[PDB]
Design an enzyme around this catalytic site. Structure first.
Site, mmCIF file in Angstrom:
data_model
loop_
_atom_site.group_PDB
_atom_site.id
_atom_site.type_symbol
_atom_site.label_atom_id
_atom_site.label_comp_id
_atom_site.label_asym_id
_atom_site.label_seq_id
_atom_site.Cartn_x
_atom_site.Cartn_y
_atom_site.Cartn_z
ATOM 1 N N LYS A 16 28.712 -18.043 -47.875
ATOM 2 C CA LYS A 16 28.381 -18.785 -49.084
ATOM 3 C C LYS A 16 29.584 -19.611 -49.518
ATOM 4 O O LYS A 16 30.661 -19.066 -49.766
ATOM 5 C CB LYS A 16 27.950 -17.818 -50.203
ATOM 6 C CG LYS A 16 27.057 -18.439 -51.278
ATOM 7 C CD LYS A 16 26.527 -17.365 -52.249
ATOM 8 C CE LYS A 16 25.181 -17.676 -52.879
ATOM 9 N NZ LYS A 16 25.254 -18.750 -53.900
ATOM 10 N N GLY A 20 27.118 -25.252 -49.667
ATOM 11 C CA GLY A 20 26.086 -24.682 -48.819
ATOM 12 C C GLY A 20 26.234 -23.207 -48.522
ATOM 13 O O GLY A 20 27.196 -22.565 -48.950
ATOM 14 N N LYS A 41 21.578 -23.183 -42.118
ATOM 15 C CA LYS A 41 22.421 -23.762 -43.157
ATOM 16 C C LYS A 41 21.556 -24.511 -44.156
ATOM 17 O O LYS A 41 20.757 -25.372 -43.770
ATOM 18 C CB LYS A 41 23.505 -24.679 -42.578
ATOM 19 C CG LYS A 41 24.623 -24.951 -43.573
ATOM 20 C CD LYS A 41 25.863 -25.563 -42.941
ATOM 21 C CE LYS A 41 26.869 -25.845 -44.021
ATOM 22 N NZ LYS A 41 28.051 -26.574 -43.494
ATOM 23 N N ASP A 133 39.012 -28.951 -41.854
ATOM 24 C CA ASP A 133 39.158 -27.549 -42.245
ATOM 25 C C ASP A 133 39.151 -26.584 -41.042
ATOM 26 O O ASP A 133 38.527 -25.524 -41.106
ATOM 27 C CB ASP A 133 38.109 -27.152 -43.326
ATOM 28 C CG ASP A 133 38.313 -25.794 -44.011
ATOM 29 O OD1 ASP A 133 39.482 -25.333 -44.102
ATOM 30 O OD2 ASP A 133 37.301 -25.185 -44.437
HETATM 31 C C1 LIG Z 1 26.404 -21.340 -37.178
HETATM 32 C C2 LIG Z 1 26.756 -19.869 -37.193
HETATM 33 C C3 LIG Z 1 26.376 -19.070 -36.120
HETATM 34 N N1 LIG Z 1 26.682 -17.774 -36.119
HETATM 35 C C4 LIG Z 1 27.384 -17.230 -37.112
HETATM 36 N N2 LIG Z 1 27.708 -15.880 -37.018
HETATM 37 C C5 LIG Z 1 28.344 -15.077 -37.994
HETATM 38 C C6 LIG Z 1 29.195 -15.583 -38.996
HETATM 39 C C7 LIG Z 1 29.800 -14.725 -39.916
HETATM 40 C C8 LIG Z 1 29.613 -13.332 -39.834
HETATM 41 N N3 LIG Z 1 30.257 -12.458 -40.760
HETATM 42 C C9 LIG Z 1 29.906 -12.707 -42.172
HETATM 43 C C10 LIG Z 1 30.935 -12.032 -43.094
HETATM 44 N N4 LIG Z 1 31.206 -10.617 -42.740
HETATM 45 C C11 LIG Z 1 30.530 -9.677 -43.646
HETATM 46 C C12 LIG Z 1 31.144 -10.194 -41.319
HETATM 47 C C13 LIG Z 1 30.136 -11.002 -40.478
HETATM 48 C C14 LIG Z 1 28.791 -12.837 -38.803
HETATM 49 C C15 LIG Z 1 28.164 -13.690 -37.901
HETATM 50 N N5 LIG Z 1 27.761 -17.967 -38.158
HETATM 51 C C16 LIG Z 1 27.466 -19.266 -38.259
HETATM 52 N N6 LIG Z 1 27.879 -20.013 -39.369
HETATM 53 C C17 LIG Z 1 28.720 -19.571 -40.405
HETATM 54 C C18 LIG Z 1 28.472 -18.362 -41.061
HETATM 55 C C19 LIG Z 1 29.290 -17.929 -42.091
HETATM 56 C C20 LIG Z 1 30.342 -18.731 -42.503
HETATM 57 C C21 LIG Z 1 30.576 -19.972 -41.908
HETATM 58 S S1 LIG Z 1 31.874 -21.006 -42.521
HETATM 59 O O1 LIG Z 1 32.138 -21.911 -41.470
HETATM 60 O O2 LIG Z 1 32.911 -20.198 -43.055
HETATM 61 N N7 LIG Z 1 31.311 -21.990 -43.769
HETATM 62 C C22 LIG Z 1 30.511 -21.669 -44.992
HETATM 63 C C23 LIG Z 1 29.012 -21.784 -44.720
HETATM 64 C C24 LIG Z 1 30.760 -20.284 -45.601
HETATM 65 C C25 LIG Z 1 30.842 -22.691 -46.085
HETATM 66 C C26 LIG Z 1 29.763 -20.395 -40.855
#
Ligand SMILES: Cc1cnc(Nc2ccc(N3CCN(C)CC3)cc2)nc1Nc1cccc(S(=O)(=O)NC(C)(C)C)c1
Ligand SMILES: Cc1cnc(Nc2ccc(N3CCN(C)CC3)cc2)nc1Nc1cccc(S(=O)(=O)NC(C)(C)C)c1
Ligand SMILES: [Cl-]
Ligand SMILES: [Zn+2]
Length: 289
Positions: A16, A20, A41, A133
């Site tokens: 979050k 977005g 997203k 970033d």
């Molecule tokens: C496009 C995409 C594909 N797979 C995953 N996998 C993913 C990402 C984060 C976790 N975390 C979340 C936080 N935590 C509790 C452990 C697992 C697990 C799987 N994430 C994706 N996108 C994504 C997810 C979370 C954060 C980000 S991000 O790049 O940090 N940008 C925003 C959206 C927060 C502004 C990008």
């Protein structure tokens, strides 16, 4: 391919931001839970100004096809709650992956990820795109042998006549490790993305630190949550080393030299991603043979 909003089953919220959010969903048109797990997203606020920016972001990701860049799957329309559908990378951010699985990561592996980041970033420059970033937060892990640049929310297209992009607004950006010219003059370029990678390189060789030492001993000591605590550790190390980032314990001199060069105060005096990937690959080849 085309996606229907009604067939998207919410599983978990992944991230979050201020503009977005990314959710882990199942695209289940058969309605039997057999469907594919995807990353979705969506905008936090649906307005014409936010939709125009999101459409530019979608068009940037759609134009990128590389092994070290998160795959675009499609879009989800309504009229007008536009959603971006991407492949789901199960091991999350490189920041989190390194901390959870440090016990099974060696220097050969850290360099493999480094080369992959460098290659993904050199492809980005090919299309004249500025990430703005680059962080261990948005570099995601597909598996133990592959990492991908997984978010392009702040990506800008460089004007044909200029080698930089001036952001004429402060904004609530998640950017922390600003290059000197990005903080002072608001200018973002390939060189500022190189600055951002130097910090990424530093972090990588910090999380690998053997056992119970400086990065593990700190995270223990603190009495709070996560994400923002990692910058606190780096700020302390920076404070302990007269304002410049130190050589992580065990880090080879060659990799620290690369870190150092990426942190050159002069824009035109920073290395290129192409040359960085080539340098990292030579270090890896010498370790193996
Ligand atoms: C496009 C995409 C594909 N797979 C995953 N996998 C993913 C990402 C984060 C976790 N975390 C979340 C936080 N935590 C509790 C452990 C697992 C697990 C799987 N994430 C994706 N996108 C994504 C997810 C979370 C954060 C980000 S991000 O790049 O940090 N940008 C925003 C959206 C927060 C502004 C990008
Ligand atoms: C988000 C943010 C906002 N303002 C400032 N200001 C800042 C911080 C440190 C200095 N230092 C640099 C080191 N030097 C020895 C003393 C002054 C100067 C300004 N820094 C921020 N983040 C940040 C914190 C620590 C280091 C870095 S950085 O990535 O080293 N980039 C800068 C300092 C050149 C901008 C960036
Ligand atoms: Cl201390
Ligand atoms: Zn808004």
């Amino acid at each position: 391919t085309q996606f229907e909003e009604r067939h998207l089953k919410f599983l978990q919220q992944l991230g979050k931001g201020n503009f977005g959010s990314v959710e882990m969903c199942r695209y289940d048109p058969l309605q039997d839970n057999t469907g594919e797990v995807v990353a979705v997203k969506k905008l936090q606020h649906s307005t014409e100004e936010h939709l125009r920016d999101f459409e530019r972001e979608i068009e940037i990701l759609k134009s990128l096809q590389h092994d070290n860049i998160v795959k675009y799957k499609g879009v989800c329309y309504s009229a007008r709650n536009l959603k971006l559908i991407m492949e789901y990378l199960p091991y999350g951010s490189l920041r989190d992956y390194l901390q959870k699985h440090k016990e099974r990561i060696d220097h050969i592996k850290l360099l493999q990820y480094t080369s992959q980041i460098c290659k993904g970033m050199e492809y980005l420059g090919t299309k004249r795109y500025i990430h703005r970033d680059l962080a261990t937060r948005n570099i995601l892990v597909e598996n133990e042998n592959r990492v991908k640049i997984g978010d392009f929310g702040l990506t800008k297209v460089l004007p044909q006549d200029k080698e930089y992009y001036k952001v004429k607004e402060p904004g609530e950006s998640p950017i922390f490790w600003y290059a000197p010219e990005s903080l002072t003059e608001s200018k973002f370029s390939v060189a500022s993305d190189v600055w951002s990678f130097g910090v990424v390189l530093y972090e990588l060789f910090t999380y690998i630190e053997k056992s119970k030492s400086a990065p593990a001993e700190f995270m223990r000591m603190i009495g709070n949550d996560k994400q923002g605590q990692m910058i606190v550790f780096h700020l302390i190390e920076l404070l302990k080393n007269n304002g410049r980032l130190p050589r992580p314990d065990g880090c080879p001199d060659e990799i620290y030299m690369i870190m150092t060069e990426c942190w050159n105060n002069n824009v035109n005096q920073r290395p290129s991603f192409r040359d960085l990937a080539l340098r990292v690959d030579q270090i890896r080849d010498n370790m193996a043979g």
